[PDB]
Amino acid sequence: LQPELDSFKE
Amino acid sequence: FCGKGYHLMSFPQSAPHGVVFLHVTYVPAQEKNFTTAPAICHDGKAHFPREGVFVSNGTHWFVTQRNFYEPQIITTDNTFVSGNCDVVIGIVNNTVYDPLQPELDSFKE
Amino acid sequence: LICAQKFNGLTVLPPLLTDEMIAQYTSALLAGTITSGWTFGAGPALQIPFPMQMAYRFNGIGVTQNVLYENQKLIANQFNSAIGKIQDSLSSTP
Numbered sequence A: 001l002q003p004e005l006d007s008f009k010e
Numbered sequence B: 001f002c003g004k005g006y007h008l009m010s011f012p013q014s015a016p017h018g019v020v021f022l023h024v025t026y027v028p029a030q031e032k033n034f035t036t037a038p039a040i041c042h043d044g045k046a047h048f049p050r051e052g053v054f055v056s057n058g059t060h061w062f063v064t065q066r067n068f069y070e071p072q073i074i075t076t077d078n079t080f081v082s083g084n085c086d087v088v089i090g091i092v093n094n095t096v097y098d099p100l101q102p103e104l105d106s107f108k109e
Numbered sequence C: 001l002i003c004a005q006k007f008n009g010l011t012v013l014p015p016l017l018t019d020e021m022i023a024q025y026t027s028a029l030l031a032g033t034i035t036s037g038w039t040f041g042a043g044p045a046l047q048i049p050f051p052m053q054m055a056y057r058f059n060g061i062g063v064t065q066n067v068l069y070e071n072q073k074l075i076a077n078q079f080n081s082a083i084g085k086i087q088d089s090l091s092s093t094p
């Protein structure tokens, strides 16, 4: 979750 | 071994010079034919169901357990990916609705 | 001798199920297994594409579903070669 979430959000 | 069908329980009953069993089995009924598929390619990667099977109400595609028909939307929690979707024979195409993506998009966008 | 089995008051009764209906039972069982897996043995026979039933049986021994599908041709060749070899195995050893 965290890598994809950060990639989308940042 | 214990009654015809999928066994659930067995209540013994005493009899003269013997025993009597009451095998409580589970017998499926009211079957319905459905168009299946070994896997569902979404983004070039095959998706196989973690449990159950892929079934199609003629038009839409769903994933449900084998011994009962509870159609469920094909999400990425019901299916696991394994490799690309060019080597599985009989693969169909569809859209595995990921629960996280629209959730986060509605949250942020 | 087996040709004249009457002998002296020695009757050999014929089996109730002759070889033909036994073979019919075996063929029906084969068709049930092939086209319905285990479903026909526990209620109505529900048709299920063979490779999919094979994947189901693979799931029962530990290997995941995709092991068969990505190896379907290999497994089919292995199965057909083994079933070919079994006949020669029976013939070679009397």
Ligand SMILES: *[C@@H]1O[C@H](CO)[C@@H](O[C@@H]2O[C@H](CO)[C@@H](O)[C@H](O)[C@H]2NC(C)=O)[C@H](O)[C@H]1NC(C)=O
Pocket: B057, B058, B059, B060
């Ligand atoms: C399969 O196909 C139909 C037609 O595509 C599906 O209909 C849709 O799905 C919902 C939920 O079941 C139905 O209530 C609606 O009529 C349709 N709306 C949507 C969301 O597209 C339906 O799932 C199945 N029914 C049939 C005809 O077997």
Ligand SMILES: *[C@@H]1O[C@H](CO)[C@@H](O[C@@H]2O[C@H](CO)[C@@H](O)[C@H](O)[C@H]2NC(C)=O)[C@H](O)[C@H]1NC(C)=O
Pocket: B041, B091, B092, B093
């Ligand atoms: C699933 O979708 C993919 C991509 O949309 C399809 O792949 C295309 O297949 C055609 C063959 O008619 C090729 O000409 C295209 O180049 C392919 N596109 C890409 C980029 O993969 C695939 O055919 C679909 N599969 C099914 C069974 O519908």
Ligand SMILES: *[C@@H]1O[C@H](CO)[C@@H](O)[C@H](O)[C@H]1NC(C)=O
Pocket: B031, B032, B033
């Ligand atoms: C499903 O359809 C097939 C072919 O149309 C038919 O032979 C079969 O009996 C049907 N099965 C059920 C349970 O509806």
